[PDB]
Nucleic acid binder design. Structure first.
Length: 47
DNA sequence: TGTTTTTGAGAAGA
DNA sequence: ATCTTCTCAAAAAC
């Protein structure tokens, strides 16, 4: 189908950055992906 | 010009 | 204003 937005490596990198306090808004602008996507890969209640 | 899988804007939150 | 979740047209790839 449509290529995913981020691979396991990226997912890790991000999941770690998100747990360090990085705002999804930022990480979103940075990793070239939309915010709703991040909340999907990592619900705020999933940290 | 057709199905599939995933994206991302935006809508709505006892 | 912020934050989070959820839907859903449709991009993205073949």
């Amino acid at each position: 189908g449509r290529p995913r937005a981020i691979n396991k490596h990226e997912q890790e990198q991000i999941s770690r950055l998100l747990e360090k306090g990085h705002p999804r808004q930022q990480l979103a602008i940075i990793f070239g992906i939309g915010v709703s996507t991040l909340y999907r890969y990592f619900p705020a209640s999933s940290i």
